[PDB]
């Protein structure tokens, strides 16, 4: 009949008119970008509110900032709606100790989040990409999959046995 | 020359990282984090996955273990120990006389004849009766675990691994990783656990007014998204021309209704999608009597399309006849959990499956899951090769004795490496005796004498007593594929390491 179909068509008209206020071509990025000068914060911060950035500070000498670049570029190709930056130890923080070299973290507009510091958080010589998506996706930007890093939860025999004994017959 | 003598050290030290974890009685090791934490681990896999090394040979020889464990799922450290023992104290003389190629040539025919000797001895077993398979499985899961409804777990494991079977494509082939899923839900007695002939999904229908309880469904499986906009192709093309917007929204209706009619030209009682569904598509479907389920994962479609009852080729668009017609049972929606559960059950010859079990707490459920996972692995390994070989080190001693007899029979020019391998292959009984806690020399001499006079068809060693007893009354047996794979893998890893 003529009532329900016309009503459906008119909610499509209303919704499509409401969708005429959509985004403003925010998909310019999608590839890896590099900066190396005095371009510290006037570029990363000065952008739209609905962005998703990731910075990186390294030294280019130690063979742990060379493995992470391949993973970061691979994530860059897959996800187009993100911002990725690189720098060499001197854009900000003029003096920086070598104790915690690979520094990767996510700005938000006015409040930084998810600070990753030091080589111990990554492990070392064992960063498969999947752990990198997991760690980055623990706070937003999730694509699929879960529980793909059993290498961190090693089982302790004695404590687990005591817990099982005290819980099973409780 | 010094390259081999340098690379052998890393191999032997990694082999010596874990050596006493074999057998029933085993020790435990401790790792110390840089901050100060302490973890006391027993698995060989956890240790040989945590420590990182430098020399490339050590990295490759660690990776071999995990690569092999990915497929067979039974033996990991035995090949490492055997390769290390063979490498350590066999080839260094032969390098001192500078003849590597002769050593490799001897290795090839040694592998060939030991494989032939292992194939010579075997005992067949029937596969019709399941009681003796249950007994064998129970003997196999005698490994350290908790005996809580073990017989039930073994029975369910046997039933599932027999039901998945093969589809007569490239001869027998059994897969367990992709066509078996475990689901655990709290509440109710533990006896109700059983195997389900169909498949379960955690989602529900998209609109309250569609029918749920159906009899004899006709399922269609379909990918991609029903909705179609393609806005990004044409955006802000003469923004002042809203007539363009009106025309495009008018013409999209023709495409949507054409797709709907093409689908509705058949009788697809149920429609399963993955991306999403719009309002016109669901409205048109609801005009007729169809049910839709939205946004299911890829693996669930893999199970359903795997002849779970709904034999479907999963075609994206413009399907044909006889690719939708399927023989299934009952489709139901339940409220056992907080979320509705879909049941597609009582089908015929379902190649897929879904195993569920019930318990009060979650940790006991995790333990039971681990137990039945191990049982399923063993039962899958058994069915591929229906022949068995005695274990406990008797096979190794028999092979070594036959090799020694052959070496003294033909007495070839390169017999020294042959004998070196022959009496270097016997490291496992020494380790078992050392772990037991008795004298190695006297027991080894007694075993050699028994193999010389009685031929030790089934006589071996006991890991809990330390006395030479016959295994016919003991009941210790192992399959045939694992031993061959281990011996081979050791041979080619040794050859590859020596080739550098
Ligand atoms: N009751 C027993 N008596 C003597 N030897 C045993 C007994 N049970 C197991 N073994 C031997 O101990 C070995 C231990 O195997 P396992 O723990 O799986 O290590 P791997 O994964 O390296 O095979 C097996 O190869 C088996 O031959």
XYZ file of C-alpha atoms and ligand atoms in Angstrom:
697
model
C 0.000 0.000 0.000
C 0.852 3.708 0.020
C 1.366 4.552 3.708
C 4.323 2.527 4.996
C 6.389 2.734 1.800
C 5.958 6.510 1.551
C 6.787 6.867 5.250
C 9.978 4.841 4.738
C 10.918 6.929 1.706
C 10.372 10.136 3.666
C 12.555 9.007 6.563
C 15.252 8.299 3.966
C 14.779 11.826 2.609
C 15.029 13.305 6.111
C 18.056 11.193 7.067
C 19.912 11.926 3.821
C 19.261 15.643 4.302
C 20.531 15.316 7.884
C 23.662 13.598 6.531
C 24.390 16.604 4.288
C 26.396 18.045 7.225
C 29.000 15.266 7.074
C 32.779 15.548 7.406
C 34.980 18.010 5.528
C 37.496 15.757 3.719
C 39.488 14.653 6.765
C 41.053 11.680 4.917
C 44.046 13.614 3.555
C 46.517 11.458 5.501
C 46.965 7.703 5.148
C 50.720 7.366 4.696
C 53.823 7.830 6.821
C 55.050 11.403 7.282
C 58.474 12.564 8.460
C 59.609 15.818 10.071
C 63.039 16.667 11.441
C 63.254 20.434 12.055
C 61.940 22.894 14.639
C 58.332 21.887 13.878
C 57.692 20.607 17.419
C 54.017 21.108 18.331
C 52.688 23.677 15.862
C 51.864 20.862 13.397
C 50.744 17.857 15.454
C 48.405 19.864 17.697
C 47.124 22.244 14.995
C 44.596 19.964 13.298
C 40.989 18.842 13.547
C 39.459 17.571 16.761
C 38.458 14.183 15.349
C 41.971 12.925 14.610
C 44.025 9.997 15.908
C 47.754 10.763 16.055
C 50.879 8.768 16.962
C 54.332 10.274 17.455
C 57.774 8.629 17.659
C 61.201 9.616 19.014
C 64.305 7.518 18.390
C 68.020 7.732 17.567
C 68.359 5.657 14.312
C 71.456 3.923 15.722
C 70.094 1.153 17.959
C 68.470 -1.812 16.097
C 65.127 -1.493 17.873
C 64.005 1.756 16.230
C 64.536 0.089 12.838
C 62.247 -2.883 13.472
C 59.410 -0.721 14.803
C 59.371 1.473 11.681
C 58.292 -1.412 9.440
C 55.433 -2.254 11.807
C 54.399 1.396 12.057
C 54.365 1.793 8.266
C 52.379 -1.429 7.901
C 49.792 -0.037 10.297
C 49.880 3.238 8.349
C 48.885 1.487 5.121
C 46.019 -0.431 6.745
C 44.467 2.490 8.646
C 44.009 5.644 6.522
C 42.184 7.771 9.107
C 45.149 8.327 11.449
C 48.122 10.672 11.736
C 51.681 9.343 11.960
C 54.808 11.413 12.636
C 58.523 10.739 13.026
C 61.389 12.769 14.471
C 65.005 12.341 15.557
C 65.606 13.199 19.196
C 65.737 16.978 18.709
C 62.360 18.397 17.599
C 61.283 18.816 21.220
C 63.090 18.062 24.484
C 66.512 19.404 23.396
C 68.365 17.071 25.789
C 67.170 13.486 26.084
C 68.827 10.539 27.863
C 69.602 7.295 26.071
C 68.104 5.198 28.886
C 64.613 5.204 27.312
C 65.206 5.653 23.598
C 62.127 4.377 21.688
C 59.357 6.743 22.791
C 55.939 6.269 21.183
C 52.788 7.989 22.397
C 49.404 9.356 21.357
C 48.492 13.008 21.672
C 44.941 14.146 22.089
C 43.956 17.773 21.718
C 45.029 19.234 25.062
C 45.638 15.999 26.993
C 48.190 13.314 26.121
C 47.283 9.649 26.609
C 48.901 6.212 26.626
C 52.505 7.143 27.335
C 54.847 4.323 26.287
C 58.398 4.631 27.618
C 61.462 2.415 27.696
C 62.425 -0.784 25.887
C 61.029 -3.056 28.611
C 57.380 -2.478 27.670
C 57.967 -3.722 24.117
C 59.924 -6.764 25.241
C 62.733 -6.724 22.705
C 63.685 -8.511 19.472
C 60.253 -10.161 19.673
C 57.755 -7.472 18.620
C 55.467 -9.219 16.184
C 52.991 -6.773 14.678
C 49.926 -8.280 16.380
C 51.175 -7.239 19.821
C 51.594 -3.737 18.409
C 47.979 -3.500 17.247
C 46.905 -4.934 20.605
C 48.873 -2.378 22.633
C 47.724 0.487 20.412
C 44.108 -0.750 20.462
C 43.856 -1.076 24.237
C 42.732 2.584 23.978
C 40.630 3.076 20.846
C 41.279 2.092 17.210
C 40.302 -1.584 17.464
C 40.037 -3.740 14.344
C 39.455 -7.329 15.543
C 40.899 -10.280 17.500
C 41.771 -10.784 21.170
C 44.098 -12.799 23.418
C 46.917 -13.104 20.876
C 49.824 -12.584 23.317
C 50.155 -15.657 25.568
C 53.910 -15.024 25.819
C 53.413 -12.458 28.604
C 51.246 -14.569 30.966
C 53.659 -17.316 31.947
C 52.144 -19.763 34.421
C 53.556 -20.043 37.931
C 53.105 -23.652 39.010
C 53.059 -23.321 42.800
C 50.817 -20.268 43.218
C 48.334 -21.451 40.583
C 48.243 -24.909 42.178
C 47.534 -23.401 45.606
C 44.771 -21.219 44.151
C 43.189 -24.179 42.349
C 43.348 -26.337 45.482
C 41.802 -23.646 47.686
C 39.093 -22.766 45.137
C 37.995 -26.194 43.867
C 37.072 -27.640 47.280
C 36.016 -24.360 48.929
C 86.830 -24.890 9.839
C 86.498 -22.815 13.007
C 82.980 -21.743 11.974
C 81.489 -25.148 12.804
C 83.390 -25.377 16.099
C 82.026 -21.938 16.998
C 78.427 -22.591 15.989
C 78.261 -25.962 17.768
C 78.717 -24.262 21.160
C 75.493 -22.254 20.886
C 73.573 -25.355 19.809
C 74.844 -27.454 22.710
C 74.281 -24.705 25.285
C 70.699 -24.124 24.119
C 70.147 -27.887 24.242
C 71.545 -27.888 27.792
C 69.243 -25.005 28.791
C 66.510 -27.606 29.358
C 67.407 -31.298 29.589
C 65.893 -32.760 32.797
C 62.258 -31.866 32.031
C 61.691 -35.110 30.095
C 59.687 -38.008 31.479
C 57.169 -38.277 34.323
C 59.612 -37.211 37.038
C 61.105 -33.827 36.161
C 62.673 -30.805 37.828
C 61.652 -27.138 37.664
C 63.550 -23.987 36.711
C 63.459 -20.330 37.734
C 63.696 -17.124 35.702
C 64.625 -13.752 37.199
C 63.247 -10.525 35.753
C 65.581 -7.492 35.699
C 63.408 -5.571 38.171
C 63.347 -8.428 40.681
C 60.315 -10.549 39.858
C 60.439 -14.339 39.999
C 58.576 -16.916 37.889
C 59.089 -20.662 38.382
C 58.176 -22.385 35.114
C 58.007 -26.080 34.206
C 57.108 -26.069 30.498
C 59.983 -26.443 28.076
C 58.104 -24.273 25.589
C 57.875 -21.315 27.959
C 61.611 -21.369 28.667
C 62.641 -21.821 25.035
C 60.285 -18.999 24.061
C 61.352 -16.393 26.644
C 65.158 -16.194 26.631
C 66.522 -14.444 23.549
C 69.920 -15.260 22.055
C 72.264 -13.700 19.499
C 74.046 -16.112 17.152
C 71.865 -16.837 14.093
C 72.215 -20.617 14.402
C 70.680 -20.546 17.877
C 67.769 -18.470 16.586
C 67.063 -20.896 13.748
C 67.307 -23.950 15.990
C 64.892 -22.393 18.489
C 62.435 -21.539 15.707
C 62.454 -25.151 14.484
C 60.881 -26.309 17.763
C 57.872 -23.987 17.610
C 57.396 -24.598 13.886
C 57.218 -28.352 14.513
C 54.916 -27.925 17.521
C 52.502 -25.925 15.361
C 51.501 -29.046 13.390
C 51.993 -32.347 15.243
C 51.250 -31.064 18.736
C 52.884 -33.982 20.570
C 56.686 -33.914 20.800
C 58.853 -30.796 21.092
C 61.916 -31.214 23.330
C 62.816 -34.766 22.265
C 64.050 -33.654 18.840
C 66.087 -30.847 20.434
C 67.749 -33.240 22.887
C 68.443 -35.847 20.201
C 69.917 -33.298 17.785
C 72.128 -31.797 20.484
C 73.364 -35.189 21.675
C 74.138 -36.326 18.125
C 75.903 -33.060 17.266
C 78.000 -32.792 20.430
C 80.064 -35.978 20.549
C 79.923 -37.550 17.084
C 81.400 -35.324 14.376
C 84.378 -33.652 16.075
C 86.727 -36.592 15.469
C 85.576 -36.758 11.844
C 86.327 -33.046 11.529
C 89.749 -33.703 13.079
C 90.397 -36.044 10.138
C 88.854 -33.524 7.674
C 86.172 -35.465 5.785
C 82.793 -33.704 6.150
C 81.305 -34.916 2.868
C 81.931 -38.552 3.817
C 80.128 -37.886 7.107
C 77.105 -36.453 5.284
C 77.078 -39.379 2.841
C 77.135 -41.797 5.778
C 74.332 -39.819 7.437
C 72.056 -40.171 4.408
C 72.177 -43.969 4.232
C 72.110 -44.205 8.033
C 68.818 -42.295 7.989
C 67.503 -44.499 5.183
C 68.321 -47.790 6.888
C 67.172 -46.712 10.362
C 63.862 -45.602 8.833
C 63.594 -48.987 7.114
C 64.378 -50.784 10.385
C 61.747 -48.752 12.243
C 59.206 -49.563 9.525
C 60.107 -53.260 9.836
C 58.604 -53.548 13.338
C 54.956 -52.577 13.890
C 51.749 -54.083 15.253
C 48.352 -53.306 13.683
C 45.260 -52.507 15.727
C 41.598 -52.585 14.738
C 39.591 -49.358 14.591
C 36.007 -50.671 14.664
C 35.636 -50.914 18.453
C 35.815 -47.719 20.502
C 36.307 -49.222 23.978
C 39.969 -50.033 23.375
C 40.503 -46.574 21.876
C 39.021 -45.144 25.074
C 41.436 -47.297 27.083
C 44.393 -46.105 24.984
C 43.296 -42.480 25.386
C 42.946 -42.926 29.154
C 46.473 -44.347 29.259
C 47.676 -41.396 27.154
C 46.136 -38.744 29.436
C 47.877 -40.335 32.423
C 50.088 -37.248 32.141
C 49.966 -34.873 35.128
C 46.397 -33.530 35.350
C 43.274 -33.698 37.534
C 40.974 -36.722 37.214
C 37.555 -35.056 37.260
C 35.152 -36.727 34.809
C 38.114 -37.784 32.667
C 36.185 -40.637 31.033
C 33.433 -38.261 29.909
C 35.971 -35.842 28.425
C 37.715 -38.660 26.567
C 34.407 -39.969 25.202
C 33.306 -36.548 23.947
C 36.737 -35.946 22.407
C 36.599 -39.265 20.567
C 33.084 -38.579 19.295
C 33.945 -35.112 17.976
C 37.218 -36.103 16.318
C 35.524 -39.075 14.663
C 32.592 -36.961 13.461
C 34.678 -34.245 11.782
C 36.503 -36.950 9.742
C 37.277 -36.082 6.104
C 35.375 -35.087 2.970
C 37.208 -37.410 0.521
C 39.401 -34.621 -0.887
C 43.035 -35.630 -1.203
C 42.464 -38.820 0.823
C 41.997 -38.796 4.596
C 42.608 -35.407 6.191
C 41.457 -34.467 9.693
C 41.322 -30.867 10.901
C 40.514 -29.899 14.485
C 41.628 -26.280 14.753
C 38.919 -24.785 12.532
C 35.971 -27.197 12.791
C 35.626 -27.483 16.571
C 34.870 -24.698 19.046
C 34.533 -24.891 22.834
C 31.860 -22.855 24.628
C 31.442 -22.717 28.405
C 28.439 -21.256 30.229
C 28.051 -21.219 34.033
C 25.144 -22.823 35.829
C 23.669 -26.304 36.063
C 25.101 -29.731 36.766
C 28.350 -30.853 35.139
C 26.712 -34.019 33.772
C 24.740 -32.117 31.116
C 27.924 -31.438 29.127
C 27.700 -33.049 25.697
C 28.466 -32.640 22.003
C 26.005 -30.626 19.919
C 25.338 -31.771 16.355
C 24.805 -28.219 15.097
C 26.359 -24.823 15.793
C 25.753 -21.933 18.198
C 26.054 -18.189 17.647
C 25.762 -15.448 20.262
C 23.539 -13.007 18.340
C 19.798 -12.613 17.714
C 17.280 -11.236 15.224
C 17.182 -7.555 14.294
C 13.454 -6.875 14.752
C 10.934 -8.184 17.305
C 8.138 -8.991 14.837
C 9.944 -11.657 12.785
C 9.316 -15.366 13.275
C 11.881 -17.358 15.268
C 10.718 -20.962 15.743
C 10.938 -22.466 12.249
C 10.705 -26.054 11.010
C 12.779 -27.365 8.080
C 14.626 -24.164 7.107
C 16.137 -23.287 3.728
C 19.270 -21.318 4.595
C 21.156 -18.981 2.262
C 24.651 -17.713 3.074
C 25.586 -14.337 1.649
C 28.548 -11.976 1.979
C 28.911 -8.229 1.359
C 26.330 -5.628 2.403
C 22.732 -5.303 1.239
C 22.867 -1.509 1.495
C 24.587 0.429 -1.284
C 25.365 4.152 -1.271
C 28.753 4.773 -2.965
C 28.645 8.382 -1.811
C 32.400 8.999 -1.884
C 32.360 8.666 -5.680
C 30.113 11.740 -6.058
C 30.410 14.282 -3.234
C 29.657 18.018 -3.458
C 29.069 17.852 -7.216
C 27.291 21.190 -7.757
C 26.279 21.557 -4.107
C 23.589 24.049 -5.155
C 21.957 21.271 -7.236
C 19.823 19.431 -4.699
C 17.975 17.943 -7.679
C 21.058 15.751 -8.111
C 20.552 14.488 -4.554
C 16.876 13.810 -5.263
C 17.703 11.954 -8.483
C 20.420 9.799 -6.916
C 18.226 8.871 -3.949
C 15.427 8.041 -6.394
C 17.619 5.844 -8.600
C 19.188 4.004 -5.654
C 15.720 2.635 -4.868
C 15.733 0.792 -8.198
C 19.040 -0.901 -7.349
C 17.873 -1.828 -3.844
C 14.595 -3.300 -5.080
C 16.379 -5.175 -7.879
C 18.710 -6.785 -5.336
C 15.759 -7.623 -3.088
C 13.825 -9.217 -5.955
C 16.860 -11.210 -7.090
C 17.224 -12.624 -3.578
C 13.475 -13.218 -3.178
C 13.240 -15.107 -6.485
C 13.972 -18.240 -4.400
C 12.792 -19.421 -0.977
C 15.657 -18.390 1.352
C 13.926 -18.636 4.737
C 17.038 -17.373 6.573
C 19.563 -14.760 5.425
C 22.982 -14.347 7.073
C 25.143 -11.293 6.350
C 28.357 -9.806 7.709
C 28.600 -6.066 7.006
C 25.181 -4.556 7.689
C 21.577 -4.114 6.613
C 19.650 -0.953 5.706
C 15.968 -0.102 6.284
C 14.568 -0.692 2.775
C 16.127 -4.155 2.571
C 14.746 -5.284 5.932
C 11.379 -3.664 5.170
C 11.118 -5.562 1.881
C 12.139 -8.801 3.589
C 9.573 -8.230 6.351
C 6.926 -7.682 3.670
C 7.449 -11.377 2.957
C 8.232 -13.947 5.676
C 12.032 -14.030 6.022
C 14.392 -13.838 9.004
C 17.758 -12.069 8.990
C 20.861 -12.207 11.195
C 23.452 -9.440 10.953
C 27.208 -9.113 11.501
C 28.493 -12.617 12.193
C 32.223 -13.278 12.285
C 34.195 -14.936 9.495
C 34.961 -18.155 11.376
C 31.277 -18.715 12.162
C 30.482 -18.531 8.449
C 33.353 -20.952 7.855
C 31.765 -23.441 10.268
C 28.219 -23.030 8.943
C 29.262 -23.252 5.285
C 31.308 -26.384 6.115
C 28.340 -28.725 5.692
C 27.028 -28.148 9.197
C 23.757 -29.115 7.508
C 23.604 -26.056 5.266
C 25.639 -27.048 2.217
C 26.284 -23.621 0.671
C 28.985 -22.183 -1.598
C 28.672 -18.684 -0.039
C 28.298 -16.665 -3.241
C 28.344 -12.842 -3.008
C 25.708 -11.886 -5.590
C 23.617 -13.306 -8.445
C 23.346 -16.827 -7.064
C 21.990 -19.911 -8.830
C 19.626 -22.721 -7.906
C 20.628 -25.800 -5.869
C 23.289 -23.710 -4.134
C 20.729 -22.711 -1.497
C 18.703 -25.914 -0.989
C 19.927 -27.590 2.182
C 18.891 -30.275 4.626
C 18.812 -29.054 8.218
C 16.791 -29.604 11.378
C 15.416 -26.998 13.770
C 16.233 -23.306 14.131
C 15.628 -21.872 17.598
C 16.367 -18.816 19.715
C 17.043 -19.364 23.419
C 17.346 -17.142 26.491
C 19.679 -19.360 28.524
C 22.083 -16.435 28.870
C 21.540 -12.715 29.252
C 21.879 -12.589 25.461
C 19.805 -14.683 23.086
C 21.491 -17.750 21.598
C 20.922 -19.161 18.112
C 20.566 -22.926 17.651
C 20.730 -24.648 14.256
C 20.519 -28.293 15.251
C 19.414 -31.825 14.338
C 21.032 -31.795 10.902
C 22.472 -34.690 8.869
C 26.167 -35.731 8.630
C 27.359 -32.336 9.941
C 31.039 -31.905 9.133
C 31.267 -28.974 11.554
C 30.482 -29.169 15.279
C 30.250 -27.181 18.503
C 31.143 -28.641 21.902
C 29.702 -27.133 25.082
C 30.155 -27.982 28.748
C 28.652 -26.678 31.983
C 30.119 -25.988 35.411
C 29.582 -23.827 38.461
C 32.916 -21.975 38.392
C 35.012 -20.821 35.451
C 38.451 -22.120 36.467
C 37.339 -25.753 36.638
C 35.904 -25.145 33.173
C 39.308 -23.935 31.975
C 40.997 -27.037 33.401
C 38.453 -29.356 31.758
C 38.933 -27.495 28.476
C 42.694 -28.059 28.619
C 42.205 -31.755 29.404
C 39.857 -32.438 26.511
C 42.050 -30.384 24.169
C 44.972 -32.703 24.894
C 42.735 -35.755 24.469
C 41.511 -34.496 21.088
C 45.094 -33.931 19.932
C 46.079 -37.503 20.793
C 42.962 -39.004 19.213
C 43.485 -37.059 15.987
C 47.070 -38.296 15.819
C 45.964 -41.910 16.284
C 43.405 -42.142 13.460
C 45.765 -41.035 10.673
C 48.074 -44.033 11.213
C 46.383 -47.101 12.751
C 49.659 -48.815 13.719
C 51.514 -48.553 17.029
C 55.118 -49.006 18.168
C 56.392 -49.852 21.681
C 58.120 -47.057 23.557
C 60.240 -46.567 26.662
C 63.526 -46.610 24.746
C 63.275 -50.229 23.583
C 62.849 -49.148 19.956
C 65.988 -46.995 20.102
C 68.062 -49.852 21.529
C 66.724 -52.299 18.933
C 67.498 -49.871 16.099
C 71.011 -49.282 17.448
C 71.634 -53.027 17.775
C 70.452 -53.641 14.207
C 72.677 -50.806 12.972
C 75.676 -52.290 14.797
C 74.957 -55.718 13.304
C 74.778 -54.221 9.808
C 77.993 -52.251 10.368
C 79.813 -55.421 11.393
C 78.114 -57.273 8.508
C 79.086 -55.268 5.430
C 81.925 -53.326 7.150
C 82.035 -50.386 4.783
C 84.887 -47.935 4.385
C 83.035 -45.159 6.266
C 81.763 -47.393 9.083
C 83.168 -45.259 11.925
C 80.565 -42.434 11.687
C 77.897 -45.115 11.230
C 78.839 -46.749 14.535
C 79.233 -43.319 16.147
C 75.596 -42.555 15.340
C 74.572 -46.097 16.313
C 75.820 -45.823 19.899
C 75.170 -42.081 20.140
C 71.431 -42.570 19.499
C 70.941 -44.138 22.969
C 70.800 -40.960 25.074
C 67.138 -41.266 26.147
C 67.469 -44.392 28.370
C 70.466 -42.811 30.107
C 68.411 -39.704 30.891
C 65.520 -41.840 32.145
C 67.837 -43.832 34.422
C 69.490 -40.661 35.729
C 66.105 -39.105 36.508
C 64.963 -42.319 38.209
C 67.925 -42.207 40.591
C 69.891 -45.434 39.964
C 73.268 -46.366 38.499
C 73.456 -45.760 34.753
C 76.301 -48.132 33.859
C 74.924 -51.354 35.351
C 71.380 -50.796 34.069
C 72.681 -49.913 30.599
C 74.855 -53.040 30.534
C 71.911 -55.197 31.624
C 69.703 -53.657 28.929
C 72.390 -54.251 26.295
C 72.733 -57.885 27.377
C 68.957 -58.392 27.297
C 68.753 -56.851 23.822
C 71.608 -59.123 22.737
C 70.111 -62.397 24.002
C 66.338 -61.817 24.297
C 66.179 -59.277 21.415
C 63.877 -57.167 23.643
C 60.803 -57.316 21.435
C 58.840 -55.595 24.211
C 61.255 -55.481 27.177
C 62.174 -51.949 28.212
C 62.565 -49.758 31.298
C 60.172 -48.432 33.942
C 60.271 -44.740 34.812
C 58.754 -45.125 38.288
C 60.563 -48.260 39.532
C 63.897 -48.452 37.716
C 63.717 -52.182 36.961
C 63.848 -53.950 33.602
C 60.291 -55.189 33.016
C 58.285 -56.333 30.014
C 55.910 -53.762 28.536
C 53.362 -56.306 27.276
C 51.869 -56.455 30.780
C 52.652 -52.768 31.426
C 50.744 -51.137 28.566
C 52.974 -48.356 27.222
C 52.668 -47.593 23.511
C 53.100 -44.677 21.119
C 51.989 -43.901 17.547
C 54.266 -44.175 14.508
C 54.139 -40.753 12.819
C 55.717 -38.853 15.725
C 58.875 -40.981 15.871
C 59.457 -40.757 12.117
C 58.914 -36.992 12.096
C 61.304 -36.526 15.026
C 64.059 -38.660 13.488
C 63.721 -36.960 10.106
C 63.658 -33.410 11.499
C 66.789 -34.193 13.510
C 68.510 -35.535 10.387
C 67.810 -32.547 8.153
C 68.560 -29.989 10.873
C 71.930 -31.677 11.451
C 72.670 -31.729 7.713
C 71.660 -28.077 7.301
C 73.794 -27.003 10.259
C 76.793 -28.923 8.903
C 76.334 -27.550 5.368
C 77.457 -24.039 6.381
N 55.665 -44.186 32.082
C 56.742 -43.916 31.307
N 57.879 -44.639 31.413
C 58.955 -44.380 30.648
N 58.999 -43.401 29.727
C 57.929 -42.600 29.512
C 56.714 -42.819 30.313
N 55.818 -41.901 29.910
C 56.407 -41.159 28.938
N 57.666 -41.570 28.704
C 58.593 -40.984 27.705
O 58.933 -39.646 28.072
C 58.877 -38.780 26.937
C 58.290 -37.435 27.348
O 57.487 -36.886 26.305
P 56.995 -35.358 26.415
O 56.912 -35.021 27.884
O 55.787 -35.179 25.525
O 58.221 -34.544 25.767
P 58.329 -34.403 24.168
O 57.293 -33.356 23.846
O 59.754 -33.971 23.924
O 57.997 -35.783 23.654
C 58.043 -39.488 25.880
O 58.718 -39.450 24.621
C 57.907 -40.922 26.351
O 58.557 -41.801 25.429
